[PDB]
Design a protein around this ligand. Structure first.
Ligand SMILES: *[C@@H]1O[C@H](CO)[C@@H](O[C@@H]2O[C@H](CO)[C@@H](O)[C@H](O)[C@H]2NC(C)=O)[C@H](O)[C@H]1NC(C)=O
Ligand SMILES: *[C@H]1O[C@H](CO)[C@@H](O)[C@H](O)[C@@H]1O
Ligand SMILES: *[C@H]1O[C@H](CO)[C@@H](O)[C@H](O)[C@@H]1O
Ligand SMILES: [Ca+2]
Ligand SMILES: [Ca+2]
Ligand SMILES: [Ca+2]
Ligand SMILES: [Ca+2]
Ligand SMILES: [Ca+2]
Ligand SMILES: [Ca+2]
Length: 311
C-alpha cells in the first residue's frame, strides 16, 4: 500500500515517510494498535517513531552495497498494527547519490610501443569504474594535449565506454623516447567527479639509423719518411640508435687493394688508422681507401666514407 523514497547515505533520523498519517492513525492509536515493524531484516535500516509515527532511517544506507548496478533499489519493510490486526507492505526506494568518483586500476600505466608503429595503430586503454548509476557513472574521457596520440571512445552495444589510443603521427625514439599522457575519466554528476591515470609511453628502439662519419670525404697528407706505428687518423662515426643498434665496428671496403690492405692498418673498435709498411713517394703519391662503419643489429646498417691520403 505505501511507497516512500529516501536519498542514499542520508544521516540517521532522516524522514522517509509519515506512516501513521498515511494509515489514518493519530495520538493514542499508535500505542493502542501497537504500531510496529516486521520481524524481517529490513527493519535494521529503518525506525518507526513511537511519537511521530513517521518512518525514519536507522543507519547510513549505501545503495551501492545494496543494489549494486540495479536501475532501482527497493527495500521492502512490513508495518504491523493490532486491534484489529492488519499488515501494510511498505516499499522504500533508495535514490542514487553521486558520491562515488571514477577510479582506475592503476595510477600509472606503462605502454611499450615500437618505434616502427604504423599510423592508425589502435591501443586499447583500461576502462575506469564508477559504482554509481545513471549519469552518476563515467560519462566521458579526456586525453592531455599531445602531438602523436589521439583519444577515441566508442560506446558498445552494452552501453559501457571503451577508450583507446590512436597513433596520429609516427613515433621517433631518437627525438623523444617517452611520451607521458594523462587519461582522465569524468562522470556526469554536477559537480562532476573524476579520476586519472598517468600513461607513460615507452618508445622501443628500432634500428632505422645507419652510422654517419663527420665528413663524407676527408683528405689528409703524409710525408715520405713517415715511420711505422704512427697513427694517421681516427675514424669517427655516430649512430643515434640505442644499445646494440648504436654500437659499431669499423672495416675497409670488400674490394680494397691488397697493397692498401697491407700498408694501412685499422682498428675495428677505435677506428684509428696506423701505417705498418714503408711509404715511398716514387711508388705512389695518392691513395683512396673505402672506410665503412657497421652497426651491430638485425637488419644491420652501414655508413661509408672515403679517405684520401696524399704522399
Ligand atoms: C665525432 O663526431 C661527433 C658528431 O659528429 C662529435 O660529437 C660532438 O657531440 C657534442 C655533444 O654535446 C656536440 O656538442 C658537438 O658539437 C659534437 N661535435 C661535432 C664536431 O659535431 C664528436 O665529438 C666527434 N668525436 C671526435 C673525437 O671528434
Ligand atoms: C577531474 O575532472 C573533474 C571535472 O573536470 C574535476 O572537477 C576534478 O577536479 C578532476 O580534475
Ligand atoms: C592523475 O592525478 C592523480 C592525482 O594527482 C594521480 O594520482 C594520477 O596518477 C594521475 O596523474
Ligand atoms: Ca554510496
Ligand atoms: Ca551512489
Ligand atoms: Ca559518480
Ligand atoms: Ca627513428
Ligand atoms: Ca631507432
Ligand atoms: Ca644503427
Amino acid at each position: 500500500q505505501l511507497r516512500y523514497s529516501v536519498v542514499e547515505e542520508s544521516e540517521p533520523g532522516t524522514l522517509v515517510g509519515n506512516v501513521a498519517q498515511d494509515l489514518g492513525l493519530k495520538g493514542t492509536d499508535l500505542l493502542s494498535r501497537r504500531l510496529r515493524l516486521g520481524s524481517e531484516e529490513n527493519g535494521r535500516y529503518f525506525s518507526l517513531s513511537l511519537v511521530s509515527g513517521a518512518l525514519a532511517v536507522s543507519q547510513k544506507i549505501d545503495r551501492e552495497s545494496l543494489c549494486g548496478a540495479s536501475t532501482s533499489c527497493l527495500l521492502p519493510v512490513q508495518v504491523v498494527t493490532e486491534h484489529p490486526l492488519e499488515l501494510t507492505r511498505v516499499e522504500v526506494e533508495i535514490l542514487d547519490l553521486n558520491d562515488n568518483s571514477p577510479s582506475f586500476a592503476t595510477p600509472d600505466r606503462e605502454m611499450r610501443i615500437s618505434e616502427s608503429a604504423a599510423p592508425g595503430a589502435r591501443f586499447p586503454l583500461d576502462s575506469a569504474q564508477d559504482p554509481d548509476v545513471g549519469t552518476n557513472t563515467v560519462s566521458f574521457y579526456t586525453l592531455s594535449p599531445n602531438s602523436h596520440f589521439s583519444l577515441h571512445v566508442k560506446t558498445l552495444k552494452d552501453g559501457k565506454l571503451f577508450p583507446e589510443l590512436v597513433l596520429e603521427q609516427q613515433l621517433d625514439r631518437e627525438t623523444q623516447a617517452r611520451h607521458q599522457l594523462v587519461l582522465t575519466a569524468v562522470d556526469g554528476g554536477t559537480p562532476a567527479r573524476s579520476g586519472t591515470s598517468l600513461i607513460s609511453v615507452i618508445v622501443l628502439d628500432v634500428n632505422d639509423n645507419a652510422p654517419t662519419f663527420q665528413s663524407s670525404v676527408l683528405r689528409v697528407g703524409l710525408p715520405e719518411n713517415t715511420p711505422p706505428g704512427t697513427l694517421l687518423l681516427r675514424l669517427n662515426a655516430t649512430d643515434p640508435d640505442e644499445g646494440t643498434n648504436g654500437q659499431l665496428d669499423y672495416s675497409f671496403g670488400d674490394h680494397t687493394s691488397e697493397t692498401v690492405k697491407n700498408l694501412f692498418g685499422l682498428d675495428p673498435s677505435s677506428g684509428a688508422i696506423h701505417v705498418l709498411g714503408p711509404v715511398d713517394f716514387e711508388e705512389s703519391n695518392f691513395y683512396e681507401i673505402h672506410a665503412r662503419a657497421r652497426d651491430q643489429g638485425q637488419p644491420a646498417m652501414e655508413g661509408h666514407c672515403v679517405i684520401q691520403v696524399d704522399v
